[PDB]
Design a protein around this nucleic acid. Structure first.
Ligand code: ANP
Ligand code: ANP
Ligand code: MG
Ligand code: MG
Ligand code: NA
Ligand code: NA
Lengths: 658, 658
DNA sequence: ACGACCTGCGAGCACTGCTTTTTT
DNA sequence: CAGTGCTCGCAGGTCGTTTTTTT
């Protein structure tokens, strides 16, 4: 449509980035400087002005929510936004592998494991190894290796003779045996979503070429929190036409603990020596006051690229800090002030509370509840992570794929029905010699070489299952989930122990209703049940299917509660950062890691601060409760860093020193 | 109504007996001589001629069937038969005790034990005693003692130092402890029906006097097979007005094995020296031929009152014997011959088959079934004795009487439901210290001493029971038995194991239909369900509630199959006596007792023979199978006794001597 | 606080012997 | 046929570890 007018909506530098077009380009700019805004315009300009087809554009965001929100804002500038490919790296790996996984041994209908699934496999494999040792420790090494794009052999030659507390080679062994067992189940994990796609593109160059036709102009936001495997994925993708534009801010890199590699963004002009580089200097988000506090804070980190971050707004309402006697007084001080400011005109949805750890939510929730301030909890106890839901989702996995063993393992027991704690072991070894088909072991229980005591109990389960499978061979997702819930015998259990079980079956109802809202959605026209489970498996804390599911019964236009980490990318007129304490911000872990630990936490704190547009209120306590015990608390060292740049305050409005 | 005409319907001697009136009278006559006929006429004559009120007459028969049949025949002769009191001794014991048992500590709603109930009590009591030994051996000593009218102390002074194989004093102890336990349950047994009534009449002379107004003219049939307890009951009853007429034949005394005392009848005039004695000399039942065989047979017994038994009919068809190679050939020979005679004109219901033991019925049944000759089995597997029935009747006992422990014990685990085997025990001692009520223990399980690990299971049973008790507090027996069968969970068990279970639930349906037919009867107008259980408890082999229930689906006008014992009193134009073998008739038991054993068996055989009116066919085998093995068979010694008086015969018509 | 471990109870399934003398 | 013995399934209890952050 000739595009949106750049120089109308952007400053000249933003506008020249948005006008970039072909070849590698790197956009590097401090917080609140309009990196994401420039991205949105760039996408509309490629289409409007350079006549790029939407179905040739890929934009990779940190969360699907962030991608939905970009897409929409792009539709306001230019037609055809519906056709843009926009998602996380992991969501793209699903889409690529679902389409092309058969070129590298992934049979169609492969299953995507969750963390509980990974432990079934681990416990199963670790027995014979020189590895006491907790299955989850092993799981942590494997995830991290995959983020690093390491094979087991690679891990054998890794730097440290000890990983967590394990011998390097025992760890590699574990990983290696987990790998065989996981492939024997036609299954893959979260990190495989990235590593397998990379393997696909290297092994099958004609496949890379086909995908490059849809990913001809590549955009990647949050490039600072990219890992080696995502790095390598992006390289392969761009390798042909080299239309790669990345955007990020090294001061806001807060995922090293999980694999993020800040050198991806700092080496970009080395890896693409023909890149254009655009640097935004002006923050548009924040009051000049919160900004000065931000800049003086981040100047304490060392080895950082010094970049200009200059204010455009005036120095607004001053920044404040409050130390409460108690975390409970913190509670009340937050809860009280929400009102005052509401009373003065700011809507609930323009205010947020940020905390270092999810444990700190509980007290805050109750403090707003008491005063009935509506609350919206992001990233709390995940709804697709509850036992009830995964149990039903397991029944669903097993129905589509009768050869899925870890699914069986999880629900053969619940409800109880002649579960062979002894018997299952026997069906398990029986299956391996015959071949790993465990569900078939149950059907062949009465007829073949048998397990004596409860042969029939197996058969009945085999028949219960085929009825589900026949009900999945066609017959609708939301109602198929009713089929499973009813006939499995799951509901009548929860009703007969319906005390906390009513709480549990109340959630099972939501599942059907989610499966329903999803079915009746725009993008899911003719969507399979497999498709539903795919989406449910890939949700971020900030995604709709999660926030709605978990805040059901809450109004929108509520106060938002989340971690400092989930705040990445967002912005609010009013921000409360709570628990600014040595031991929390920075965490004890980061303290124990030395300067490089502290520097990560400082970035985290810097993110928190630069979330606020009009007012920032930080608080701390002198005492706080851990799991059952109360200990004295100290201010964060980070407050020392920004002394002189905020006012200390008592429960009421006014001045205190410190 | 002026009565029936005696001299029209009876010979002069019979008529003068039928005309007796006041004071003791003894009628003593051989088989087929019209003792029972005279009794029937005498009853009508007391009413018609002497103006005795029916409600003043008592006639004690050996079975309720025999009493129904007398009553009816009396109704043809005189109005007011409906009001006569006619029954067995044991049935009269129930009526007397139900009315007056509270005068001797029997609280209303006392329960009548069956043989399974007795064993519950036995096993419970014999633990501590110098008694290995089977609970049923003890049970047999107790029953015998009661028939003798012995107390435990009496048994301590009894003749033999060994009873069965027990020391005399351990047996008396057993009996003595059984007694306490049985009374602690407000319960009584079958023999108590006679001994407690006797105790009632001795302890409470005003009660005897009230009953004597209904039993003013007493009649007793089969007086030869009365035991001492019955002997003493009759004496008490007659002690005031002394209008006692007894009828019997010592040649047909066949119950010594159970207590019968032949001296009751032989001493009647020592006991009533002012008695009149009537003796019938003429048999009216039998062909002169079967009669000569009977007489020559009985003449072998010694020390018997030698009385005239002269024929009135002509020497009809000759009596025959057949030896068959097999019991199977016996089967076929009986089966084949039933038809011949059927073909010649005899109806099925004019023919019967008599065997020493109930085991012999199986082969016979099948032989008639093969040739589809309709069969009616008397005294086979008792219908009110099957497990399913006593289970439901136990539920019913418990509903009426929540304090019945034996009932509880039997069904607390039918169906299963936290049948605390260990819990029961813990439930049992709980109740002992607090007090007998075991059902309360189950209700008090959540509360109090806390029978744990399944507390609720007990409570739910206590609740299931109150619902039955509430449903027995009012409502209909036939539909209350539905209530029990449904809600107990009994039916859905038998349906879920409905294989031989369908055979078992088919029977449960008959129960409701019996319960119903009984309700809709003439005498049970406004009948309690307690009343129903009373009647079911007191059936003889020959009684309607039993034969109908056990031959359901069979036509009437069928061939009758029963033991020689159950033939007492009856008559048939055609009689087959099978298995006339040494070891059977006489039994090994009788053989081992010496001449007094042989003499009892000879009486038994004499009864069999004098059942036949027109034709008697006896058979024996050379081989026979017991339970597994097959052994050689030998003719009965009794055939030697009657040689010259029957024809030996081939499977066809005529002679094969031997 | 959370599951991953233990003690003990219920019950189903099999192994094993006189069932058969007669029954109010 | 029943009375008895062996082994298996499942609950109601106990204990130590929880989280640092999460695509
Ligand atoms: N040229 C501009 N004119 C007006 N508002 C702007 C301009 N550039 C950025 N903004 C606003 O500044 C705020 C932050 O922009 P955003 O594009 O979210 O910055 P970012 O660099 O992408 N923020 P962060 O991801 O947290 O480092 C938004 O509310 C934008 O609307
Ligand atoms: N005076 C009679 N006239 C005709 N038939 C008679 C006469 N007396 C007896 N009977 C018949 O003979 C058969 C036997 O009579 P019953 O009154 O049954 O004898 P009982 O002495 O009571 N028999 P039992 O009990 O087996 O020793 C019946 O069929 C009677 O009808
Ligand atoms: Mg941004
Ligand atoms: Mg008679
Ligand atoms: Na595209
Ligand atoms: Na009477």
């Amino acid at each position: 449509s000739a595009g949106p007018d750049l120089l109308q909506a952007l400053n000249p530098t933003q506008a020249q980035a948005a006008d970039h077009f072909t070849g590698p380009a790197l956009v590097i700019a401090g917080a609140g400087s309009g990196k994401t805004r420039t991205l949105i315009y760039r996408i509309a300009h490629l289409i409007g002005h350079y006549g790029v087809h939407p179905g040739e554009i890929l934009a990779v965001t940190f969360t699907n929510k962030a991608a939905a929100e970009m897409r929409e804002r792009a539709g306001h500038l230019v037609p055809g936004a519906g056709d843009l490919w926009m998602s996380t790296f992991h969501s793209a790996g699903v889409r690529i592998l679902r389409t092309y996984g058969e070129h590298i041994g992934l049979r169609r209908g492969f299953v995507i494991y969750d963390d509980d699934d990974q432990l079934d496999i681990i416990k199963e494999v670790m027995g014979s190894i020189p590895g006491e040792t907790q299955p989850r420790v092993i799981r942590g090494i494997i995830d991290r290796a995959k983020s690093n794009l390491w094979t087991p052999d690679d891990l054998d030659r890794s730097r440290e003779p000890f990983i967590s507390g394990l011998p390097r080679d025992a760890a590699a062994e574990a990983y290696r045996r987990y790998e065989v067992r996981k492939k024997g189940q036609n299954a893959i994990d979260f990190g495989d979503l990235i590593t397998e796609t990379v393997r696909l593109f290297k092994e099958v160059p004609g496949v890379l070429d086909k995908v490059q036709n849809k990913a001809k102009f590549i955009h990647v936001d949050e490039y600072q929190d990219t890992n080696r495997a995502q790095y390598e994925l992006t390289r392969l993708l761009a390798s042909r036409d080299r239309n790669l534009l990345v955007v990020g801010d090294p001061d806001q890199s807060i995922y090293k603990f999980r694999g993020a590699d800040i050198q991806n963004i700092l080496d970009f002009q080395k890896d693409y020596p023909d890149a254009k580089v655009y640097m935004l200097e002006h923050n548009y988000r924040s009051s000049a006051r919160v900004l000065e506090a931000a800049n003086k804070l981040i100047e304490n980190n060392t080895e950082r690229l010094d970049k200009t971050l200059k204010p455009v707004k005036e120095a607004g309402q001053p920044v404040t800090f409050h130390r409460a006697t108690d975390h409970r007084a913190e509670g009340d001080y937050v809860a009280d002030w929400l009102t005052r400011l509401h009373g003065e005109g700011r809507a609930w949805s323009e205010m947020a509370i940020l905390y270092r750890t999810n444990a700190q939510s509980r007290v805050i929730e109750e403090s707003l509840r008491r005063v009935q301030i509506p609350a919206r909890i992001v990233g709390g106890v995940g709804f697709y992570d509850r036992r009830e839901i995964r149990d039903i989702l397991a029944y669903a996995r097993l129905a589509l794929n009768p050869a899925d063993d870890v699914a069986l393992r999880r629900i053969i027991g619940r409800p109880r029905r002649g579960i062979g704690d002894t018997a299952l072991q026997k069906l398990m070894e029986w299956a391996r010699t015959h071949h790993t088909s465990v569900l078939t072991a149950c059907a062949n229980a009465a007829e073949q070489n048998i397990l004596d005591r409860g042969a029939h109990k197996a058969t009945e389960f085999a028949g219960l299952m085929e009825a589900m499978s026949e009900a999945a061979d066609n017959y609708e997702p939301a109602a198929f989930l009713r089929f499973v819930m009813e006939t499995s015998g799951y509901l009548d259990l929860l009703r007969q122990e319906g005390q906390e079980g009513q709480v549990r079956l109340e959630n099972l109802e939501e599942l059907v209703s989610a499966a329903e809202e999803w079915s009746q959605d725009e993008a899911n026209v003719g969507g399979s049940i497999a498709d539903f489970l795919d989406d449910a498996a890939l949700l971020s804390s900030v995604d709709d299917m999660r926030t709605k599911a978990e805040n059901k019964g809450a109004p929108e236009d509520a106060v938002t509660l989340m971690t400092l980490h989930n705040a990445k990318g967002l912005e609010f007129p009013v921000v409360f950062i709570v628990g600014v304490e040595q031991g929390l911000l920075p965490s004890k872990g980061a303290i124990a890691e030395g300067p490089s630990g502290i520097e990560e936490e400082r970035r985290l704190f810097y993110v928190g601060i630069t979330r606020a547009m009009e007012r920032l209120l930080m608080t701390a306590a002198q005492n706080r409760m851990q799991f059952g015990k109360t200990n004295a608390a100290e201010d964060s060292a980070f407050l020392e860093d920004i002394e002189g740049l905020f006012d200390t305050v008592d429960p009421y409005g006014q001045p205190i020193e410190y």
